[PDB]
Write an enzyme that holds these catalytic residues in place. Sequence first.
Site, mmCIF file in Angstrom:
data_model
loop_
_atom_site.group_PDB
_atom_site.id
_atom_site.type_symbol
_atom_site.label_atom_id
_atom_site.label_comp_id
_atom_site.label_asym_id
_atom_site.label_seq_id
_atom_site.Cartn_x
_atom_site.Cartn_y
_atom_site.Cartn_z
ATOM 1 N N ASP A 1 0.859 -1.218 0.000
ATOM 2 C CA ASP A 1 0.000 0.000 0.000
ATOM 3 C C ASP A 1 0.881 1.250 0.000
ATOM 4 O OD1 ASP A 1 -2.238 -1.470 -0.040
ATOM 5 O OD2 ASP A 1 -2.562 -1.448 2.090
ATOM 6 N N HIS B 1 13.321 11.708 -12.097
ATOM 7 C CA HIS B 1 13.022 10.246 -11.995
ATOM 8 C C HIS B 1 11.642 9.973 -12.600
ATOM 9 C CE1 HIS B 1 11.866 12.903 -8.929
ATOM 10 N NE2 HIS B 1 10.955 12.099 -8.374
ATOM 11 N N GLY C 1 18.261 22.986 -2.930
ATOM 12 C CA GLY C 1 17.105 23.918 -2.769
ATOM 13 C C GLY C 1 15.812 23.192 -3.148
ATOM 14 N N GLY D 1 -2.719 2.837 -7.751
ATOM 15 C CA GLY D 1 -1.677 3.233 -8.740
ATOM 16 C C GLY D 1 -0.461 3.814 -8.015
ATOM 17 N N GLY E 1 -0.472 6.282 -6.211
ATOM 18 C CA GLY E 1 -0.926 6.866 -4.917
ATOM 19 C C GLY E 1 -0.349 6.061 -3.749
ATOM 20 N N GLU F 1 6.242 12.177 6.103
ATOM 21 C CA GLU F 1 5.686 11.576 4.857
ATOM 22 C C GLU F 1 4.534 10.637 5.214
ATOM 23 O OE1 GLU F 1 8.446 9.873 2.276
ATOM 24 O OE2 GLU F 1 9.849 11.504 2.385
ATOM 25 N N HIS G 1 1.280 12.357 5.528
ATOM 26 C CA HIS G 1 0.631 12.633 4.217
ATOM 27 C C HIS G 1 -0.052 11.355 3.730
ATOM 28 C CE1 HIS G 1 1.886 16.575 4.199
ATOM 29 N NE2 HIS G 1 3.128 16.497 3.714
ATOM 30 N N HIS H 1 -1.140 19.535 6.546
ATOM 31 C CA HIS H 1 -0.233 20.377 7.379
ATOM 32 C C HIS H 1 -1.043 21.090 8.467
ATOM 33 C CE1 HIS H 1 2.507 20.313 3.699
ATOM 34 N NE2 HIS H 1 3.023 19.470 4.596
HETATM 35 C C1 CGS Z 1 9.737 16.762 8.623
HETATM 36 O O1 CGS Z 1 8.626 17.263 7.878
HETATM 37 C C2 CGS Z 1 8.907 17.816 6.613
HETATM 38 C C3 CGS Z 1 8.862 16.990 5.401
HETATM 39 C C4 CGS Z 1 9.152 17.561 4.101
HETATM 40 C C5 CGS Z 1 9.486 18.960 3.972
HETATM 41 S S1 CGS Z 1 9.779 19.643 2.353
HETATM 42 O O2 CGS Z 1 10.630 20.789 2.443
HETATM 43 O O3 CGS Z 1 10.106 18.589 1.442
HETATM 44 N N1 CGS Z 1 8.264 20.299 1.692
HETATM 45 C C6 CGS Z 1 7.841 21.633 2.258
HETATM 46 C C7 CGS Z 1 8.108 22.908 1.469
HETATM 47 C C8 CGS Z 1 9.426 23.202 0.934
HETATM 48 C C9 CGS Z 1 9.686 24.410 0.184
HETATM 49 C C10 CGS Z 1 8.595 25.315 -0.017
HETATM 50 N N2 CGS Z 1 7.327 25.067 0.478
HETATM 51 C C11 CGS Z 1 7.092 23.893 1.202
HETATM 52 C C12 CGS Z 1 7.306 19.273 1.144
HETATM 53 C C13 CGS Z 1 6.438 18.674 2.272
HETATM 54 O O4 CGS Z 1 5.579 19.317 2.882
HETATM 55 N N3 CGS Z 1 6.663 17.396 2.551
HETATM 56 O O5 CGS Z 1 5.927 16.771 3.542
HETATM 57 C C14 CGS Z 1 6.490 19.537 -0.154
HETATM 58 C C15 CGS Z 1 6.831 20.854 -0.844
HETATM 59 C C16 CGS Z 1 6.647 18.437 -1.203
HETATM 60 C C17 CGS Z 1 9.541 19.798 5.157
HETATM 61 C C18 CGS Z 1 9.254 19.234 6.466
HETATM 62 CA CA CA Z 2 16.623 19.718 -1.872
HETATM 63 ZN ZN ZN Z 3 10.224 11.556 -6.527
HETATM 64 ZN ZN ZN Z 4 4.385 18.058 4.047
#
Ligand code: CGS
Ligand code: CA
Ligand code: ZN
Ligand code: ZN
Length: 169
Positions: free
Chosen positions: A58, A68, A78, A90, A92, A119, A122, A128
Amino acid sequence: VLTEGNPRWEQTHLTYRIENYTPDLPRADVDHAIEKAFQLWSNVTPLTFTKVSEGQADIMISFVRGDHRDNSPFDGPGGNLAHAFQPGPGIGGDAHFDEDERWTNNFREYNLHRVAAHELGHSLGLSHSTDIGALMYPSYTFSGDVQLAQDDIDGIQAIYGRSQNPVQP
Ligand SMILES: COc1ccc(S(=O)(=O)N(Cc2cccnc2)[C@@H](C(=O)NO)C(C)C)cc1
Ligand SMILES: [Ca+2]
Ligand SMILES: [Zn+2]
Ligand SMILES: [Zn+2]
């Protein structure tokens, strides 16, 4: 189906499988971080998880570099640090981790366990929040100890229910 593009998991049990381990750290350290995170969620919910070495799981976890076959390639250190797809069939449920940065098992540059826990939120349908103690912090930041907050506990428990069976043994 009830939600447009964001269905919740109707099953009370889920399975996951790691496609590969990043050379940055062995599997023993990574398995502990991924296993410890599942325990935190199951500890406060009657949900059960199980790692599968065969068949489609799952929740699939894999590490990727540069482009990728996706519409959101990483732009160097960045940009976002990781991402995933809404919980659904799929692709998901899948979740990728940025492998361009070095992962650590301590309060160094980045905490892999802290990101894996986010993750999963999510994948669990948790969005959030604006709570400082919530791990689902939009941007990456340095938090004190890694523990679930009341807002996160009530949120996941509210969706399914409270663990009316706190039996440790
Ligand atoms: C520990 O918890 C975390 C997990 C992932 C991230 S993350 O920087 O990758 N990000 C937050 C983001 C980055 C830059 C600009 N706007 C928002 C992803 C996010 O929220 N992932 O959960 C998103 C943009 C794909 C930050 C904290
Ligand atoms: Ca990065
Ligand atoms: Zn990826
Ligand atoms: Zn997030």
